[PDB]
Amino acid sequence: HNELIHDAVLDYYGKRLATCSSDKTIKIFEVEGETHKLIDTLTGHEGPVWRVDWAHPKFGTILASCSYDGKVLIWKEENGRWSQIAVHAVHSASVNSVQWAPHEYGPLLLVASSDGKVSVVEFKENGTTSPIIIDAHAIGVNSASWAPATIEEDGEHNGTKESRKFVTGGADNLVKIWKYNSDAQTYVLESTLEGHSDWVRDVAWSPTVLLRSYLASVSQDRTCIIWTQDNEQGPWKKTLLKEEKFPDVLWRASWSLSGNVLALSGGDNKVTLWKENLEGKWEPAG
Amino acid sequence: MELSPTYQTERFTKFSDTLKEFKIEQNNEQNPIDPFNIIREFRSAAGQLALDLANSGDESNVISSKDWELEARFWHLVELLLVFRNADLDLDEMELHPYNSRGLFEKKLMQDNKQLYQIWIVMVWLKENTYVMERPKNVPTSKWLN
Numbered sequence A: 001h002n003e004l005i006h007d008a009v010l011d012y013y014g015k016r017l018a019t020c021s022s023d024k025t026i027k028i029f030e031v032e033g034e035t036h037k038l039i040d041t042l043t044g045h046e047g048p049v050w051r052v053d054w055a056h057p058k059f060g061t062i063l064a065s066c067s068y069d070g071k072v073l074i075w076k077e078e079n080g081r082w083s084q085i086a087v088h089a090v091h092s093a094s095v096n097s098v099q100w101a102p103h104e105y106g107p108l109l110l111v112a113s114s115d116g117k118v119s120v121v122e123f124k125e126n127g128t129t130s131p132i133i134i135d136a137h138a139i140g141v142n143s144a145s146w147a148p149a150t151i152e153e154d155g156e157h158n159g160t161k162e163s164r165k166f167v168t169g170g171a172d173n174l175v176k177i178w179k180y181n182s183d184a185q186t187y188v189l190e191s192t193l194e195g196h197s198d199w200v201r202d203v204a205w206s207p208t209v210l211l212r213s214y215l216a217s218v219s220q221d222r223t224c225i226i227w228t229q230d231n232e233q234g235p236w237k238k239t240l241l242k243e244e245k246f247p248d249v250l251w252r253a254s255w256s257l258s259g260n261v262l263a264l265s266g267g268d269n270k271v272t273l274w275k276e277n278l279e280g281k282w283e284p285a286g
Numbered sequence B: 001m002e003l004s005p006t007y008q009t010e011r012f013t014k015f016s017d018t019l020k021e022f023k024i025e026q027n028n029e030q031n032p033i034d035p036f037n038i039i040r041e042f043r044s045a046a047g048q049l050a051l052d053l054a055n056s057g058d059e060s061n062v063i064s065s066k067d068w069e070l071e072a073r074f075w076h077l078v079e080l081l082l083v084f085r086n087a088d089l090d091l092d093e094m095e096l097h098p099y100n101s102r103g104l105f106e107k108k109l110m111q112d113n114k115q116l117y118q119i120w121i122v123m124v125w126l127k128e129n130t131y132v133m134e135r136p137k138n139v140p141t142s143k144w145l146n
Helices: B005-027 B036-054 B059-085 B102-112 B115-128
Strands: A007-010 A016-020 A025-032 A040-043 A049-054 A063-067 A071-077 A082-087 A095-100 A108-113 A117-122 A132-135 A141-144 A168-170 A200-205 A215-219 A224-228 A237-240 A253-255 A262-266 A270-276 A282-284
Touching (some): A007 A049, A016 A049, A025 A049, A063 A095, A071 A095, A117 A141, A141 A200, A168 A200, A215 A253, B005 B036, B036 B059, B059 B115, B102 B115
Antiparallel strands (some): A007 A016, A016 A025, A025 A040, A063 A071, A095 A108, A108 A117, A117 A132, A141 A168
16 A cells, blocks of 8 residues: 555544655545554645644644645545645745644644744634744754643733743754743743754653653654753753664654653664653663 | 721711701702702712721721722712703704714714713713723834844
8 A cells, every 4th residue: 555654643533543645645544553444535735745633623623734835735524525625825845744732722723834934823714814923943843743731820811921832843953932922022932952963853742741841852863852841830951761872763752642651763663662760761661 | 898887977977968968958048959969969978988998097998998989980970860861852953964974963863862872971981980001012123124
């Protein structure tokens, strides 16, 4: 069939699975583990399918897909069959990632281009979004995701500072989070965490926290730095999943739903599973 | 809100005085008997009582002072509508030609329906008590020049 599966995610009911390939098709599949019933094909892009993502149920089951065209062509089942419900193109230069935000964060659509620019819009059925962009990195953004959870501002007016936080990863070895500001022009950058000597690849935040927020920033320097935020709002300190160069070229590194079990996809086609050890460092569970 | 024993005696005395003045108009040979005077004297008095509760220095009476200002403002409103009802049922007449501006038409509409006229007086009352914002809370970061 496909000789190569690049990456492949699932919906939020766990009945569908969307395969990003490289022959420009998005094959929507039905998840039954290894076997799948191919229900649809959506060819209509240029070059490798880098990323697709499924919408959080309360803003459809919308599927926003990016290829090397540098455009997100959004697909939506209208009539029980796939069609095109939208188009985007404010940044073209290859859209690498294409994410939907948590329920509380809204139907925000995270675009991250390799021109050092990043869009952040809203999905509308009546149309209209205001074009808000903030510059992340400079040599490009090879992956983007979504910050942990929305915060609370207390007082008499909620949703003031922090709020929707955007985490990105450029090719200039720099990983950091934001803080949506409304009193200082562009998004005031936090702290530049330089701990990389080769381009940043994948970034994932842990939807499981205790007293610190974990941020797995992968790189092509064959290590994964785990950024432990001290008391969750403290500084980001250096905690090493492995201190040494793995003889594996690491790609994705995505956390589980519960737990701080992290899967890192090694270049030798072996997905190690890491748990944090007897100390603050990490040891493999497999 | 919080009554306090001291101020409660004053509460009764200034409101009792407003009445004492009204009975004074009725025996007096030099003074019109009009009920609109009564309401007005309560309006002043409600206002003085909040000040006096502020001036105590008690944090609890500061709370009452806010409630009593509210009551004092309510009398003002009350006065205006009660005058209107009892005296003003037509405005000066305006022209009815179709070539007249928007303005002559607005005025003529207020002469017919006095209900909206009431709607406007309350609206003015809300407005006055609502302050016009201060300077912008987010100025440019020296854009365009770049």
